[PDB]
Amino acid sequence: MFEQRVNSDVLTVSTVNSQDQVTQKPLRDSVKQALKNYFAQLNGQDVNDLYELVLAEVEQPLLDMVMQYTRGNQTRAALMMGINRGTLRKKLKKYGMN
Amino acid sequence: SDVLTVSTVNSQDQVTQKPLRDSVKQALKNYFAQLNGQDVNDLYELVLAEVEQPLLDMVMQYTRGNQTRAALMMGINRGTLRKKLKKYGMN
DNA sequence: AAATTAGTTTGAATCTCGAGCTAATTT
DNA sequence: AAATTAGCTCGAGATTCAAACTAATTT
């Protein structure tokens, strides 16, 4: 009665295909594309922060959204994110959202 | 300027970059809409996994399997990297 | 009025880190 | 042969955690 939703189709993005149709592709694939494009524009420059870089690009929208969902309620936001309330306050401060 | 972007296409078949954070934002709005007040619980490990896997995968490809060079690029410890590689069964 | 949340501290537990070593692999 | 990397181990330092609490806010 319940069709399987694989982990990769839980967070998805609208895309356009070779027959000009709108389809949902995983968010992972967006991340793959951002990076292929990041790499292509390196031309041998040194990177030492790729993890923090990516992590930010993802924490900011996540906090942004969960805070809107909870209408500013930090205790609720922490409970649905699955992290300590203090940890959250730390992150909110890090991105100027407190 | 924004280093992490993706390609979008509009109705006039013109292509344009957009920040990766915008995709994430779309994805979450879509997730929240799809659940109607069902409780969300581990949203941080969820997203982090969706992002850490293709990150490891792309960097390992770029360094051709070299874990030591990979960790250096990412700015994390070689142990941490191995640990993450274990976590997602890429070993 | 009661209930919940914000803001804060304290210490325990978990993670991340560099460092250090040898065997295997690449150069 | 020399050089680098993989796979370990061991603390040390940093981070996340849950408890506590009271003031502030929302219900």
Residue numbers in the entry:
A (entry chain B): 1 to 98
B (entry chain A): 8 to 98
Sentences from the paper on this structure:
During the course of Fis-DNA co-crystallization trials, we obtained a 2.9 Å resolution structure of the Fis-F35 complex that crystallized with C2 symmetry, which differs from the P212121 space group observed for all other reported Fis-DNA crystal structures (this paper and). The F35 sequence differs from our canonical high affinity F1 binding site at four positions: +1C, and +3C in the core and -8A and +8T in the flanks. The lattice organization of the F35 crystals resembles that of F1 in that the DNA adopts a serpentine pseudo-continuous helix; however, the Fis dimer subunits are oriented differently between molecules in adjacent unit cells (ab-ba-ab in F35 and ab-ab-ab in F1) and adjacent DNA helices in the lattice are laterally translated. Fis binds F35 with 75-fold poorer affinity than to F1, whereas binding to the sequence F36, which contains only the +1 and +3 T to C substitutions in the core, is reduced 15-fold, suggesting that the presence of the ±8(A/T) base pairs lowers Fis binding 5-fold in the context of the F36 binding site. As expected, the Fis protein structure is essentially identical in the F35 and F1 complexes as the root mean square deviation (RMSD) of all protein atoms is 0.27 Å, and all of the protein-DNA contacts are conserved. F35 exhibits an asymmetric minor groove width profile over the center of the binding site where the minor groove at the -(2–3) base step is 0.6 Å narrower than at +(2–3). The asymmetry reflects the presence of the two C/G base pairs at +1 and +3 that promote wider minor groove widths due to the presence of the guanine 2-amino group. Whereas there are distinct (+) roll angle peaks in the F1 structure within the major groove interface, the F35 structure exhibits relatively constant positive roll angles extending from–(7–8) to–(3–4) and from +(3–4) to +(6–7). The overall DNA curvature in the F35 crystal structure is 66°, the same as in the F1 structure (both measured over the segments from -12 to +12). The F35 structure described here shows that the central minor groove within a Fis complex can be asymmetrically compressed because of asymmetrically positioned G/C base pairs.
